Every structure is written in structure tokens, then in C-alpha cells.
Amino acid sequence: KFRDGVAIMQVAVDRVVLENLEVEPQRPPGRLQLQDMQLLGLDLSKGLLLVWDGERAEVYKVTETNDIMPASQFETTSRCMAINNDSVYRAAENKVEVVNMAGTVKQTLMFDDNHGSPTSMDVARDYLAVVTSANIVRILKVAGREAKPHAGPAPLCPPELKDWKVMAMRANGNGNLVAALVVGPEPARAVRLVVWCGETNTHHVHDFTPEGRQPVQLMFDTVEPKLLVVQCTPVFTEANVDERPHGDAAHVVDCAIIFVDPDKGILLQEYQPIHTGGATACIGSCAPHLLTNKKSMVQPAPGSGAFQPFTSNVSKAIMTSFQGMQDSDDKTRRALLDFSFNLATGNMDEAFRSVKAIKNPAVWENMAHMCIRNKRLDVAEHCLSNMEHARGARALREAKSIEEADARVATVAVHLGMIEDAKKLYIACERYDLLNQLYRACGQWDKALEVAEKNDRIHLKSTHYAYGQFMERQGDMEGARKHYEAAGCGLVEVPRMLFEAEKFTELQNYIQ
Amino acid sequence: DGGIVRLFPQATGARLVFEDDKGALHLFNPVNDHVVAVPYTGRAETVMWDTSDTNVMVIGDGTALHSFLYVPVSLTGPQVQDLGKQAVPATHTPLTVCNGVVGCRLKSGAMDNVTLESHKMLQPGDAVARAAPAKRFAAALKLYKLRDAVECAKQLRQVESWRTLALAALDVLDIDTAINAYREIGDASMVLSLERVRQHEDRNLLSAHIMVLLEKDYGQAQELFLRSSVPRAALEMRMDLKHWTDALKLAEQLDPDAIATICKEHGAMLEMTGEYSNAKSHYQQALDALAVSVGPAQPDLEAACKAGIARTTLQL
Amino acid sequence: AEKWDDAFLLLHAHPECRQDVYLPYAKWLSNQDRFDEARLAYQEGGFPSLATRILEQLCANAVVETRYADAAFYYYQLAMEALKSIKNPPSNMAPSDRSALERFTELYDRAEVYYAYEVVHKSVHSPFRTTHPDTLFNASRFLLMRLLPPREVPLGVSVVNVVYVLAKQAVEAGAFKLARFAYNKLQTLVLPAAWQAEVDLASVVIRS
């Protein structure tokens, strides 16, 4: 988990690599050992990492140099818990034991047996989310000085997916929209996601196991709390071998980058790989990238046998549908994270209507510019192409050719280095013969002869006559003859007169 | 510039590097009446002409063999370019020069040949540039013997050498280098940039449309259109990719409807954008310049500008 | 019959079903570089449209070689298309029917520009002449105003001989308005730059 700016990871039974992302490379990273902690969860709050096993629970003091030592330890009256930075909501068997730094119950929050034992504990950084034994979750705001309920008690998972085994809860920043996987039962064991939208007390649905993976870590994106960046390793039942690669390499670990709509369930945007430096787990998501994991080791010092401290074992996986996002400003972040919410879910208010209809006086750097994936270019043409702004120009150059519908947008869609997106919508607008004959434009004019045959034998002769004149232009004579001859109407000149003049009949024209 | 001190004609006088009063030699092309001052100045022994090139021009002053390639046609015009100031022996008085090698005369009376620093580098027999012809590629890109560089980038075999010579020849208006690069293997879409060429011969309409297709250099493209068969192609690119840096330039002089345009999308880039104040101003003058257009008092575009004025007064 | 050749027997059957007799024929032969017999398949089956690859290829070839007469008969072929690719007739002057006339009229006007330029200007430059005596007789009554440069023309064309001979032809056979008009437009043009040292003086001299 990347929490509170500290991308803490646990790469061993006791080794907890509590890496603050701001640690200097010459400063030591997160190094911490547990005393054989049967860790059912850890809760770190900017220097107080509490780990618990079910018989003891120690809070670890951390310096800014990531020097992690136990500040305090206490027994557990119940296995799981969650800390309000001094006072730990414990997963008590009948309530929320808000136990103190020393493990004594400072405050009392209650969930009855209709809720069940409050076994799942999480403070969603302003909202203590308490999924109980029957998953009846009431979420507790802490924006004052202590806990106070925010989202009412309601089942985290629906009856059609409560029988599906509920594992944990990924409560959103507001502490109502709680993502929670449900794996299938013992005969099924297929992972579905129940994003408990506590805004409306509904239960979202996304069966990942047929849909591509079995996700391991769940987290919402740290910038937009509707972008559920679903870390996803491909694990399946014996019916879903589709996504996985062959045999032992069956984990093409790609994040289900997902903008969860609070109404229509989980709606997906893209499959973004974690595989960034041997990385198979996404531990966070910053603005420009996704904070994935990496191998945990100690870098050797350059030019010597010494060992420099590691910079960060946190690989920032660059996010791919967000083009012109990261080099650009933070109006890009709002505008086009909003547009990508309109991508996965499907909306129009955010990137366009919410910024037109408010009387907002400025001239932004990126009103919105990747918005062509919902087929609109003018937001990257008057914000950008009034002066052709460069840090959103990636999706602007995409954007002049994902307008491609053969409605004069083909011609704009083919200007310079950008016919490929015209071809992408040639596929999309059911004209992949134009995919073919304009993929011939990308420098494929040698086997464009046979792909032209695939298109038209009129296109065959167009490509052979152009290609025969192409090496006639380079200087070749006989090969010019052959591809002239291999053109059906290039053939009507070359055997006709002497086989030897397409260069020389071309020569007398300047004389004329 | 003064009196012609020395005349150095060719066999026909269609071109000549004559000397001025100061002593500086000046290549003259009276076929199309063009004068290019040679970068070599001061007194020379003679301008002997390359028997291998009427444009490449050796000045042998007894000190150096100042070769001078003459390039008459480009994006700009005639130019005299030094292919090398390479020394000559005093006893080797330049009788004639062939293939960049000056055939001089000995003191006792004989024939001696004096090469230059880079002309013989590209001539065959220089196995340094034949067994390892990448040097021929480089030095033919230097001396603009680029067909040697074309062949040598074929043999040293990468795309970027082809594109290097392709742009180096596109600057001097040669395109078969670019064909050899791109139509063998190009980036994505330059062959549809070549396919959009008309039967018009002024080279400024042509290159201006070419870089309209490349979506670049729109000020120079609009300027070249102002010298073209149509000036309004400049304003066309200006509504094609939404500029006002010269849409206003052609709009004040040609089309108040284009002023109304510029102010309509200026209101627009201030309507959805917000600051509906200057958007309101631009929408209002879009309505006005639609009314006072040299074309129609266009009612539907003015009604769209009035929907703009509705929202911008609304947010004003 | 699984044959386009054996299609033809009734794949040319009843008109107003000629679209239906020729397009089921046309998707036997059309897509296999035979969009030349598929031209006439399309002539009744739909409209002749997959026709312009060869046509404009040799149009541009004839423009390159300054032999502007293959493009003449090819724009004449486009006129034959747009004269038979019009469902509305060309004869009468209803706006649909007059536009039906106008489409192949402009294609045959391209044909006639290429005709006049190549035929008469090339009489000294490089001889290549084709004529239509009924069209040339109506030209002898009405030809003079067609020969402006920027009116659906390949451009880059010199019409020195063409201006002179066309003016004389407009003068000769009557339409006494056009005789006077061609007197005003007799000839003032110059031979190309290889002749510049002499047709500077012989611009009006060499061709009246």
C-alpha cells in the first residue's frame, strides 16, 4: 500500500519495507523486522506503523529517514484493528474496540450481531470503514478529533455475492464507495468485485475471473477516487485461460485501470501492466503514474564495492490512456482524468459541460485534450491548437486522427506521422481495407503489392505501377519493367512497344 | 560594383565568374540573369573552369584551389558554395582542372595533376571511401555529391542516413532522396503528403500546401500563399488549424466574415473556456463582422454567434 | 452458373432491373483488376465509378509528356459516363436534367480543352491531332470563348496556335457576332522560352 505518502510494502514474513517516497537515495529506505508477526494487517500513519497478528500488536515509530522501531506494543483482544493515529479501532468480536496506544479501549463504536463482529477494520484516511462479519458496513468520519459515523450501516456485498466469499474492503476517500472483492464459493472460486457504493447503498458487480484476472490488491487512484486502479495478476478458475499466457508465465500482471461508476457498477478503462522492473503488484497510484512495487534490494555504490541505499522499491508505472497528462499541468489532471471517467463509465458533464457552464475566467493550458477517445477534438483545438500547446500535444496528435470517420476527418486524420489513428478508426468505422491501403503509407510499399491484392487487384496494379515507377525513379530499369508489368495497367505499356522505354519514353517529355 | 577587371567565361559564355574592380570574383549566370558573389575575394591568378562541372568552380590563385559549387535552384535562389579551399603548389600553375583534380604544368614543361581535399574523396579509386564508403556518404553530403551519399547510405544501410540525405536534398529541392528513404520505409503518412500536389508551378504555393499537410510553418506557408496563385489558401490553413496570427492578416484585407470567424472562435475559446466577458465582446463583434462581411450578412452564423452572446451575456 | 460470362446471358436482362442484372453480374468480375468491364457492368448496374484509376493515370501521363490528348478522350470517357451515369436525362433543361447535361458537359469540356490545346498548339510543337467534324463545324460557328486559361483546364497550357486558329475558325463560318469577337481575340501569344530571342519580336508576327 502507498499510504500517506509512504509507499510501505512487506516483502517478507517480518521485513516491512516502509519506504517513504521522499527518502534521499543516500538516505536509508524503509527497513523493519517484525517479531514473527502473523500479520493480519498493518496500519501506518506517517511514522506510527501498527502491525497486529491476533495475539499482540505493536506500533512502530518511523523517522523521516525511514528508521522504523516499535514505539509501543499491546495485546489484541481481537485479531484485526485500525488506528486513529493514537487510538486503534480494534475488530472486536461484538463492537469496535477503539483501543489506545497501549491497547486499552479509549472509545466504543458498536456493531450488533445483525452486523456481526466488526472483523474488517479500515480508516479510509478520513473515514473509519467497518465491514462486519455479515459485511454490514457503517463508516466513521474522523475529520474532527475522533470517530463519528458517516456512511450508515449497510451490507458491503449483495446476497447474490455474499454467498460469494467476501475478503476485504477498499473504502474510497469519502468513506462510502467501498470496493470489495467477492471470490466465488468452494465450487466456483471466481473473483467478482462488489464496490459497495455507500452513496446509494448499492452493490456493484465485476466478475474479474472471466474478465481477465483475479486481482490481488485493490485501491482507488489517489487523485480521482472513482478511478479504481485494480491491481490484477492473472489467476483464474478452470474456465478462464483466455487472458493468461502459456503455462508458468500465466501472469501478465496488468492493472485493471477502472473508473468505477457509482451507479452502473464497475466500468473498465484499460489493462495497464505492472511489469515495470520485475513488478507484479501495484502498491499505489500517484498522479502521473501508478506506484507499483519492485524488487527489494540494496543498490551497489557506483564505481565502488560499497552499497548505496535504495532510492525507492516503488516503480511508478506510467498510465497509458492518459496521454499528454504527465508532462503537462494539473488542469490536465482534472480535465482528462475526468474525461477518462467519461471513458470507462461514460459521461459528458465533467471534461466539457462542467467547465463551460460555470463562468470560469481563465485560459487553461489543457482545458481537455485526450477527449478524442470519446470523439471530440475541438477541446484540444481551441485550448491547444490556437497555439498548438506541446504538453498535451501527444493526445492532440492522436486527436486529429481519432476523429476519423471519412467525413473530411480522414484528410485531417492523415497529415503527418498520424495516419495510424486514422487506421485505428478505419478498423472502428468498419473500413479496414483503408487500414490496409493506408498502412501501406507507413513505409510498407514493398509488400504493399500483395496487401494491395488483398485490397483490390486494381489496388494491386496501382501499387505495382507506383512501385515500378518507384525503382524507375531510383534508377532501376528491369525491376521497373517487372512491377510495371506486374501492374495490370502498368502492363499495357511495357510489352507493347519494346519493353525498354518507361525510363526513355519519360526522357522525351522534357524535349517536348 | 565597379569595372569588370577580368572576364572568365566558359566555352559559351552562358555563365562566367568575372572579377570586379576590387578583385573579388563573382559568378554570373546571364541565362536567367543572376549574379552570385564568390566567397573567394581578392586577386586570383585565374578562374579556370571545372571540365567536370560548369557550376563547381575552382579558383586557383597560386595559393589555393578554391572550388565553388554553384546551386542555382533552391527554396531561395542561386548560391555559390565553396567545396574546398585546397592549396596548390606555386610551380604547379593551374593549366586546367578535371574531376576536382587540377592538371597543372611542371617548370621544365610537362603535365602534373593536383587533387583537392574532398573532391577526390568522392571520386572512385579512393578506397578509403570505397572499402569503407561511409566516408563517401559523409563527404558527398558535404560537397552535395549526395547521390554518392545516397548509394553509400544504401550500403551503410540505415534509415536515418537516408533521412539525413533526404532532408539535405529537400533543402536544395531534391526529392528522390526522400523517396528512397520514406517509400522504402517512412514514418506514417508522408506519401499522402506527396499525393496532395497540384499541377501549379510556382514552388511557393506548392511548398506552402506541402507544409499545410505537414501542419507546420504556417506563417511561411501563408506568406508563400500571399505570393501564390491563391492568397486565400493562407486564410484556409488559418481556419483549418485555428490560427489568428494570419487569419486576421487576411481577414482585415479580404474578409470581414473571416474577422467574424476569428471573433466567433475567440468567443468560443472564451465561452467553454469561460471569461464570457471577452467572449461576449468577441461574439458581439462576430455578429457585427458577419453583418459587415464582404460576403453575405450571414444569418445562421450570426445566430450561432447570438447563441454565444446569449451564454456570454448570461455569464456576464 | 458460377460464371460471370454465363451471367451475361440474362445478367443483362430487363431494364429498370438492369441494376439488378448487372450488379449481381458485377460482383463476379469487378474486384479483380477488371474494373474496366465492371465499368460497363456499373454503367447500368449502379453507376460507372471504379473507372478513374486507369483514366487519371494516363491523364497524368499525358499531362507529363505534353501529349494532352489521352486525357482528352479520357475526360470524353468521363463525359460518356456522366452522360449515361445520369438517371435524369440531359436533353431538356429542367434543373436536375440540365445538371445531368452539365456534369458530362463539364467532363467533355475538360476533353475539349485538352483537344484544342494539344491539337492546335502541338501543330508545330509535336504533332498530335484529333477532331470531331460536327463539333468542329459548330466550333466554326461557336468556339471562341472556351479558350480562357482558368476554366476547368489542366493548366500550364500554351495556346498560341490555338488562339490564332480558333479565332480564324470563329471568324469564318458565320455567327457574325463571333467573327467580330474573334477579331478582337485574334492572336497575341508567344512561343516558349527556347524561342524567346526571336518571338520577342515575332509574338504578333508569327501567328497574326
Numbering used by the authors:
A (entry chain G): 386 to 897
B (entry chain I): 527 to 842
C (entry chain L): 790 to 997
The authors write:
These trains are formed of 22 IFT-A and IFT-B proteins that link structural and signaling cargos to microtubule motors for import into cilia. Here we use in situ cryo-electron tomography of Chlamydomonas reinhardtii cilia and AlphaFold2 protein structure predictions to generate a molecular model of the entire anterograde train.
IFT-A, which contains six proteins (IFT144, 140, 139, 122, 121 and 43), sits between IFT-B and the membrane. IFT-A is made up of five structural proteins (IFT144, 140, 139, 122 and 121) and one disordered protein (IFT43). IFT144, IFT140, IFT122 and IFT121 all have tandem N-terminal WD domains followed by extended TPR domains. The resolution of our IFT-A reconstructions was limited to 18.6 Å, potentially making subunit placement difficult. This allowed us to unambiguously place the WD domains in our map and fit the C-terminal TPR domains into the connected continuous tubular densities. We do not locate the disordered IFT43 in our overall model. IFT122, IFT121 and IFT139 form three pillars at the other end of IFT-A. The IFT122 and IFT121-WD domains are stacked together directly below the membrane.
